[PDB]
Design a protein around this ligand. Structure first.
Ligand SMILES: [Zn+2]
Ligand SMILES: [Zn+2]
Ligand SMILES: [Zn+2]
Ligand SMILES: [Zn+2]
Lengths: 697, 5, 697, 5
């Protein structure tokens, strides 16, 4: 059921957990560094888990898709063909920015955090900088121990702060991925849909130095030896069985103002969806003619598809459940309840009004802000502006550099500059700049930026062509050139005649002003948001209702039971899909083209000792009433005894609006069955060595 | 798929 | 399950029946004039049943549609608005050709029948003529008792003959029909589909004279008082429950040769569906400009829509289950199996070879034969030809007249000429003449008819448009002129300058020779077919398979249980639909425009004492694994105790191909729940007088 | 609908 429960709520959900079917004690689950919870790691726009004492890690194919794409080329396309390393020496690096974060300690810092903020008095921007100074000090102290990375989280609008300390594994290698016709069977047609038939899994291996300490890639590094790892279920999963997931959901917005929902539904999601689809069409068209563009833009293209389709789905679900009306009625109730309290209700009412004022400030420039950020997110202008900002920041002492630009951030910045080599073609990027240029010209005069209007010298197709012809002169298209600029000082950027760099230098004062506006807004949110959210919480608690914080990229536990759902009168989705379902969708063309070995094994009924007698086949995917979101991809699904029964990977179509307004009847996790993983590694794209390592072969 | 947006 | 059992097989299905859950004795189902089977009646194309001691009969809306349409005008459209007689004096005639047939006797006449056929010797045409003479003589003897209509049925290719004798009630009056938005909710979009939400019922009342004998319509007739009528169930029908149907399925083709299947699938069904859709489009466009056309052609339109969609469905179902390949494969196994019996199995093999040869002969003229028949079924050509043929037959003694043209046929003929007044618009019929002339001139040279070329004198637009203008001068567009020709003699037809009568006279010789060709093939079929089918039976038996004859418009029993089906991996259709499912389809536009009283009652949860607890609502339609087809519309669905739980009305999409190859997994009846009948008549379009009449008021 | 075709 509903609830992305933080570890600290475990006492509160131990009753419900046992009634749903958990046979482990909740005390065993409370031990976040023990068995099995200590096996769960963050990637961390995704989740994964160890499944071997020798550092083997399972996650989704969608999670490893960036890694797989980084190691693919047009001639040797691992996305299309799959990858299997027969020995550990055959494993390829997953890229310099691949990470596995293993949890080491959580600490509550609420008191000190609120003290730091309170100290700044009545000034909004000082409030933001005080919290930033606190966070940088706290993290620096925490990361004094080598090999560890720390993160400060805010929960329930600034009512609670906790610091997480993680061992940071820096050398992650690709060990196995199925062919993309299994890992992403059905492609974007099946994305966000049930019935699903997708074997969304892949394996990494974590490596550290011989000293045991984390190290960046090196042929002298050796497999990390996790304290705990998961084991496959020995009992078959069936309908109604207990399941639970622990993972790292990114964000939900269930506590938003009705006005914030209204703007997201009316402007944000349709705007983004549209921009994403425009860019998708262009790049699709270009890739059809050029196999190098196709492989190089594959990961970008997966994200644009996923997010655009998710937004279309949310807009549809909002209409399905009248979300706009449910937010308006619920807020009326909260605001009435507060007014019924005179004195002690006044601060939440004041807070409400301020959040509305801030929403209105943000709206005034929303088109300029979005369009600018996306324009500057193309590969050459993104690189130039990042590199030039770094050069500015390096002039300050480290403690005073903007987060993202401190010494601790250097490894990631540099890694991103190299990774872009596999994700960049100038001919494609020029069409993306052209699209964003044409969108900037349609903005009204009051949403324009002087520095961009000047750099353009006009408002017509000829100015656009000139700007593109000039940017074509940049040398930032080669990796070695981006890395030169990574080390160069401010003056050097300000002297250069590279047109991408000249663009950076000219817009940067403006970027810096917008950031101050965001920081000032965020400073007032820091005062108003905790106060309004405490009042929501107190209202829902007085209503009986569930109280848990919105997702914030920290570790959460959700639980429930395998079950389908009823999309309409006269029908039901069943909880499992089966091998014969995969074959029934076969067309022989992308995205319904399974490997031939899969088609043969199914036709010959080779079930590999993994058949569930209750469904007459080997299960493929299943539905359950768990509460997951973006960031839970790859999370392990554990049964009544803490054994691995699948991996979380998607939501059904009707579920996606639950980010704003939760609908119990139509919100289900979609997961890939562990037996399907095993089946593929037996009969389809064989990996006898990993099965034995795990050890189910 | 539930990767980060 | 599978099986359209004749009542003489009851002995054999007695244990299957008890195991499926029947709680009456099979002996009680055997009594065809007893309780409850004596309540089941034939309408001629549909089934119905008595439901009160005062002659009340329930059937489908789709079954009463003809009668409802006959009583409708553009100003007072009963199809749209429904009909309700507060008293029996308010009941209107269903039309002069409506009938209720109440079964009196069945006798086996096989020995005499095949003796009469044998006495013709080795001559195909004489073989047909011999059976014709035997049939007529038998019927005339059976029909000597006033008030009774008899029919000879051939089963299993001519292996068995039985004579049915029925009481012929020929004053049938409409008592109730719900609005078309209930009786046909979802229109042609939902036709042949589940989930279904359609209140497919209507009520007639049957009349006889004061002496108690049948009589045509008279204001002095009184309601028939049936010996037996059905009672509504007192137990709630649920998933898994026993159900059975008795009724009058038209035709199945499960024992056809494979070549016969291939012929139907590749040529017959696509040809007809194509022609039907073309005529739909024409009449649909004229309907929009003209409500008189719209209402006068609404019955014809429901027929074309229904059949053309059914054939579309069947073509899809053949592909889904490789029907071609199954026929091929079973044919091989029977043939293989026959020659493994040398001398003994040689007749069957001769028989197969001959049937094959008759199919080729038939195929030779099929474009001609079909185009001519459809051309001659336009309103004025149909009338002129039928009426000319009648005048020819009237010249012979009645015993020698063609079936369909004997004295016993006269009421049906005269009634049909009257009912055409409500189904005929000159302007519309002109466009269908044009259509068919155009299709005719498109035929290749072999495939043409001499007489039609001559009459037409040309093969281009000029010829057509002359024929049309020529035919515009017929006087047969009025009912009084049709009846004048109904009584006129042959010489008077031959003297006439009416252009449509002139056509009829010009082509009758041709039609007569075609009729003779057809009767020759049928006479060769008469010898071959039964020998082969006894063999197919003998084989199926040895394979322990189900053996029952293909449908032939006689009375059958099917039984089974309420259950859904799985159209696809990951999904299941539930056995029931509910009221809420009806309102969820509301669009406010035809065909999803429920009456307000229905939207309002469902909103207020006005369930009228009829909610089934297991589904939270009043049930609407349900699925079950019975084996029904065309002709079963209107059949009562009886429960374990022989009480009424619904009416059969449709099949699901995947089921329609079961006409040729039976698929148990995807073959279901759709039925309207008795409780939804009652609901509608309580809460939506009330008829508390009928409810009180049926003891449920 | 299962009327006669
Ligand atoms: Zn146990
Ligand atoms: Zn250089
Ligand atoms: Zn009983
Ligand atoms: Zn006249």
């Amino acid at each position: 059921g509903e609830g992305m429960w933080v570890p600290q709520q475990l006492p509160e959900i131990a009753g419900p957990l046992k009634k749903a079917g958990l046979k482990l004690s909740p005390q065993q689950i409370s031990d976040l560094t023990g068995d099995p919870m200590g096996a769960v790691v963050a990637l961390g726009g995704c989740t994964a888990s160890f499944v071997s004492p020798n550092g083997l890690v399972v996650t989704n194919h969608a999670c490893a898709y960036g890694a797989i794409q980084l190691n693919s080329t047009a001639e040797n396309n691992l996305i299309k063909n799959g990858f299997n390393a027969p020995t550990t020496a055959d494993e390829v690096s997953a890229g310099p920015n691949a990470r596995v974060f293993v949890l080491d300690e959580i600490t509550d810092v609420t008191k000190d955090a609120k003290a730091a903020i309170a100290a700044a008095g009545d000034d909004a921007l000082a409030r933001t900088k005080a919290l930033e100074a606190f966070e940088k000090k706290l993290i620096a102290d925490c990361e004094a121990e080598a090999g560890f990375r720390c993160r400060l989280y805010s929960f329930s609008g600034g009512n609670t702060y906790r610091l997480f300390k993680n061992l940071e594994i820096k050398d992650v290698r690709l060990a196995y991925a199925p062919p993309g016709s299994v890992g992403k069977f059905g492609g974007d047609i099946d994305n966000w849909m049930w019935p699903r038939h997708t074997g969304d899994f892949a394996f990494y291996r974590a490596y550290v130095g011989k000293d045991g300490k984390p190290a960046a890639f090196s042929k002298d590094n050796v497999p990390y030896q996790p304290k705990h790892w998961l084991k496959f279920a020995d009992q078959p999963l069936g309908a109604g069985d207990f399941v639970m997931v622990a993972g790292y959901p990114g964000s939900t917005n269930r506590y938003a103002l009705a006005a914030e929902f209204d703007n997201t539904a009316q402007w944000t999601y349709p705007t983004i969806a549209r921009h994403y689809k425009n860019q998708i069409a262009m790049v699709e068209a270009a890739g059809k003619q050029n196999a190098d563009i196709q492989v190089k833009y594959a990961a970008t293209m997966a994200g644009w598809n996923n997010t655009s389709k998710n937004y279309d789905g949310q807009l549809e679900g909002f209409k399905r459940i009248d979300a706009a009306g449910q937010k308006l009625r619920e807020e009326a109730a909260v605001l009435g309840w507060l007014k019924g309290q005179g004195a002690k209700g006044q601060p939440a009412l004041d807070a409400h009004a301020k959040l509305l004022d801030l929403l209105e400030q943000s709206k005034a420039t929303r088109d300029r802000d979005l369009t600018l950020a996306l324009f500057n997110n193309t590969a050459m202008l993104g690189s130039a502006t990042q590199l030039y900002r770094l050069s500015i920041e390096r002039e300050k002492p480290n403690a005073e550099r903007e987060s993202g630009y401190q010494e601790r951030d250097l490894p990631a910045i540099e890694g991103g500059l190299k990774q872009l080599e596999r994700r960049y073609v100038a001919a494609m990027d020029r069409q993306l700049q052209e699209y964003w240029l044409n969108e900037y010209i349609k903005l009204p005069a009051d949403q324009r930026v002087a520095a961009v209007d000047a750099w353009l010298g006009g408002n017509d197709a000829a100015a656009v062509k000139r700007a593109l012809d000039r940017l074509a002169g940049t040398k930032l298209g080669s990796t070695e050139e981006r890395l030169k600029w990574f080390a160069a000082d401010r003056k050097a950027f300000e002297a250069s005649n590279d047109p991408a760099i000249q663009y950076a230098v000219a817009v940067m004062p403006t970027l810096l002003k917008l950031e101050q506006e965001r920081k000032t807004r965020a400073g007032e949110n820091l005062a108003a948001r905790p106060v309004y959210l405490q009042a929501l919480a107190d209202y829902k608690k007085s209503q009986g209702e569930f109280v848990y914080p919105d997702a914030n990229l920290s570790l959460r536990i959700t639980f429930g039971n395998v079950m389908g759902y009823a999309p309409k009168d006269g029908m039901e989705y069943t909880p499992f899909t089966t091998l014969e379902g995969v074959v029934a969708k076969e067309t022989g063309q992308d995205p319904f083209d399974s490997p031939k070995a899969l088609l043969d094994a199914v036709a010959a009924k080779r079930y590999g000792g993994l058949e569930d007698k209750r469904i007459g086949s080997v299960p493929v995917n299943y539905l359950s009433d768990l509460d997951i979101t973006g960031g839970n991809s790859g999370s392990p699904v554990l049964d009544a005894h803490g054994k691995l029964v699948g991996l979380a990977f998607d939501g059904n179509w009707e579920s996606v609006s639950s980010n704003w307004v939760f609908d119990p009847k139509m919100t289900r996790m979609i997961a890939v069955d562990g037996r399907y993983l095993r089946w593929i590694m037996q009969e389809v794209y064989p990996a006898p060595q990993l099965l034995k390592e795990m050890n189910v072969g | 798929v539930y990767i980060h947006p």
